[PDB]
Ligand binder design. Structure first.
Ligand SMILES: Cc1cn([C@H]2C[C@H](OP(=O)(O)O)[C@@H](COP(=O)(O)O)O2)c(=O)[nH]c1=O
Ligand SMILES: [Ca+2]
Length: 129
């Protein structure tokens, strides 16, 4: 896979961010994770985690997988990186997202993220507490 440039427009919630990609605004939905909705327990925490991460980064980057690049809502499906650190992985390692929506053909980082989730569950963090 390859990392491509993007510029943060707004953090939206734990697993969606709006960003400028190839010069057009795009809402990105993080591959392979599911944060709680803002109205649910750990929703506000997930939202603040991802917001801090992307807003504090000197750059963000998006990396598409091998399969679908857009979902049925028009959202970009990507792994997002904040100064080289993957947001998707970080959320799962902190117990603020579950590994989810793992579709054949769009699951390059599945094992990386399942390992993180095992660690968060072992440490009883957030969702897992
Ligand atoms: C993460 C992801 C979500 N989606 C779709 C499936 C779900 O459809 P449904 O809306 O019909 O439930 C929805 C979940 O996103 P949210 O968790 O942002 O609600 O997004 C994909 O199609 N591919 C993906 O890789
Ligand atoms: Ca969600």
């Amino acid at each position: 896979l390859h990392k491509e440039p993007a510029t943060l427009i707004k953090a939206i919630d734990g697993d969606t961010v709006k960003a400028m990609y190839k010069g057009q605004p795009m809402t990105f939905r993080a591959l392979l994770v599911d944060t709680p909705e803002f109205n649910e327990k750990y929703g506000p925490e997930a939202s603040a985690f991802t917001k801090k991460m992307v807003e504090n980064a000197k750059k963000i980057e998006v990396e598409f997988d091998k399969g679908q690049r857009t979902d049925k809502y028009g959202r970009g499906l990507a792994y997002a990186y904040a100064d080289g650190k993957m947001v998707n992985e970080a959320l799962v390692r902190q117990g603020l997202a579950k590994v989810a929506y793992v579709y054949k053909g769009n699951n390059t980082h599945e094992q990386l993220l399942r390992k993180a989730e095992a660690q968060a569950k072992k440490e009883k963090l957030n969702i897992w507490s």
